[PDB]
Amino acid sequence: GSHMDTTITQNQTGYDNGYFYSFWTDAPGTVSMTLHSGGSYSTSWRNTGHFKAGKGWSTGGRRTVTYNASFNPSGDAYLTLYGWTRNPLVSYLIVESWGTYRPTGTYKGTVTTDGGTYDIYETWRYNAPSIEGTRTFQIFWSVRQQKRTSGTITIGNHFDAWARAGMNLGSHDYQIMATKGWQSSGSSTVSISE
Numbered sequence: 001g002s003h004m005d006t007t008i009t010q011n012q013t014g015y016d017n018g019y020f021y022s023f024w025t026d027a028p029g030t031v032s033m034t035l036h037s038g039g040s041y042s043t044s045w046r047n048t049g050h051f052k053a054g055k056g057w058s059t060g061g062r063r064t065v066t067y068n069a070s071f072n073p074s075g076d077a078y079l080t081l082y083g084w085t086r087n088p089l090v091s092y093l094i095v096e097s098w099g100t101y102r103p104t105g106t107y108k109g110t111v112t113t114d115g116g117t118y119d120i121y122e123t124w125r126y127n128a129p130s131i132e133g134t135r136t137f138q139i140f141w142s143v144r145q146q147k148r149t150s151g152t153i154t155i156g157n158h159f160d161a162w163a164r165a166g167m168n169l170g171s172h173d174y175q176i177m178a179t180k181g182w183q184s185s186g187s188s189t190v191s192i193s194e
């Protein structure tokens with residue numbers, strides 16, 4: 001990378017090189033994120049707990065985003081467009097790739113977009129870290145049926161499919177192209193653009 005890159009190890013949000021970024025983990029010291037130029041960042045993690053890290057936008061919406069990634073999980077991790085809404089309090093994931101485990105939940109249907117078919121799922125997390133604290137909230141999922149690590153995500157197509165399936169989003173908080181890890185190790189480099 002560049003000597004001007006910044007390596008992040010503490011929970012934080014902010015802006016870097018034109019883009020919002022978020023870094024969150026319950027396992028500090030097990031994961032780091034390096035913020036590169038433009039829409040790029042890398043992560044490196046080792047026997048972590050839970051982390052989510054990525055670049056994107058502080059306010060999500062129906063963006064058409066293009067991303068290129070190198071995604072190298074050892075164990076449970078996702079490469080995913082990740083975001084939050086409030087009222088309803090929902091975390092949503094458009095999962096592009098995963099490691100050892102393909103995330104699934106309550107089947108809600110399918111959506112075909114950006115040359116790929118995604119299964120739609122809903123899950124709940126109970127008493128869990130959220131943008132509003134320890135809460136019980138919904139997760140909306142679009143999980144691609146086959147892994148990919150570059151391409152375009154027409155986010156509005158996912159939002160529309162979810163609405164058709166009765167899954168309603170609230171007011172948008174942040175929206176990032178994220179690396180997300182659970183009790184695993186690995187690395188990633190992710191580059192995005194709108």
Ligand SMILES: [Cl-]
Pocket residue numbers: 007008009010
């Ligand atoms: Cl830091």
